[PDB]
């Protein structure tokens, strides 16, 4: 096999580099996996289906215009090119290779579509219609959008979107499950926490964060325990950015943010599905956990969990490794069916004050059909009142000692709304043993006198036996 | 926050029940919501298309109907590109 000949491929440092600071995608191509037979759809502001680097891979069966209610997801052209975003994301996944135009997609032989759903009024129904489009044809959905990254907001999928997620993973892809790839957020400058974003924080989405070329945490990055892994994106003005297809049939070298990281992950995941088309939606998350590489990523909070894997709140399990992903997928044994253990921790409300610590030994549903001995996701569903929400920091410690930061201080969040059965999710105890003492810590990180009460703490454990 | 005169509802009876519900309660049935079977979207025939005020009593009539599991009025969500 020959590496792509496209003019801007050398500038796609994150795909092929001389310096080992790349996503190891070349090794996947060389094994023969380019995304053939895999269908990906970008849920965004449209896709320029006639772009010279997209047309050869464009799939109308993976597309629709929810905003204007027609089958054609073509972007709305404006003087300021407002609706270029979905075309930039589509190119990272499946821009055509060896055609003398721009660069290549990670899965440059995959079929690519677009749901035009952001260029209009976005309702719960809009989101659910996009997430559930043709779920037996589209394999992978890539979404960069979410609640406002202002550091004040707590918002997630409403009831229809939440249902579309669950029907997607349970019934999509003939029962193996739709693969939802999500961007973790751009609120780093506002000290936003991506656990306050119910789309990234969901167990049904593969949440992806960003790393700069030199291996650092970008200014826009959000930390949280729900992130699974990382791919490269933009950073400072000496660091290079993402090269992809741009509106009006052009080529851009300046695609930025976590919206550039998630499509690269969707491409790598498309290569992995080609390597083993029977992988379930949970199989894919297992593969990311085992093959992601912390080595080249600089973080201030790398910690070894209970099964010996390094994890960061900025990076999840580290940088995606496409060559290791496709290699591990080929003989992967599909994991056991998902179990869900719901544990009510509190017998009565607990005053928070300056600091609250809640300790509880659990059996993880021993003696019951949902008994779990090997953990996947874990959630702390919290209900609490508080006068100044952003002053709270919340941590969850597993029996094996892994400390997940569920919520970090948000200096801009002055809400008195508290949290209403909000499910904080962590991936950091993946594969750990769930039985034993779990510890919840809630602290007032400020010197000001704050007050509140934790009324409900539901520990939800997902995994197998 | 802008509420819209669209309502979603889970109706186990299927599209014939959804159609009956629409004509009886004063909606145009727009159709099934994506791949969510038995979930349907309605537009009220007289209520304004956008309003700062929720239409609580319209919602109650729909969800109170014995053919409806639940219902909610749609509203415009602030969503940002990243
Ligand atoms: Ca259209
Ligand atoms: Ca090309
Ligand atoms: Ca955010
Ligand atoms: Na997620
Ligand atoms: Na009812």
Residue numbers in the entry:
A (entry chain A): 110 to 574
B (entry chain B): 29 to 110
Show me the paper's own sentences about this structure.
Proprotein convertases (PCs), including furin and PC1/3 among nine mammalian homologues, mediate the maturation of numerous secreted substrates by proteolytic cleavage. The zymogens of the furin-like PCs share a multidomain architecture comprising an N-terminal pro-domain, a subtilisin-like catalytic domain, and a P-domain (also called HomoB-domain). Activation of furin is triggered by two sequential autocatalytic cleavages and subsequent release of the prodomain. In this work, we investigate the structural and functional basis of PC-activation to engineer prodomain-based PC-inhibitors.
The complementary triple mutant (77)A-R-S-A-A (M2) was also resistant to proteolysis by furin but revealed more potent inhibition compared to M1 (Ki = 0.32 ± 0.03 nM). Indeed, we could obtain crystals of M5:furin and M2:furin at pH 5.9 and pH 7.0, respectively. The structures of M2:furin and M5:furin were refined to 2.0 Å and 2.4 Å resolution, respectively. Four and three copies of the PC1/3-prodomain:furin complexes were observed in the asymmetric unit for M2:furin and M5:furin, respectively. In both complex structures, the globular part of the prodomain is bound to the western rim of the substrate binding pocket. The C-terminal residues 104-110 extend over all non-primed substrate binding pockets of furin (S1-S6). The main difference between M2:furin and M5:furin is found for the secondary cleavage site loop between Lys73 and Ala83. This region was well structured in M2:furin at pH 7.0, but no electron density was observed in M5:furin at pH 5.9. Apparently, the secondary cleavage site loop adopts a specific conformation at pH 7.0 but gets unstructured at pH 5.9. In the isolated structure of M2 and in the complex structure with furin, we found an unusual interaction of the His72 side chain with the amide nitrogen atoms of Asn74 and His75.
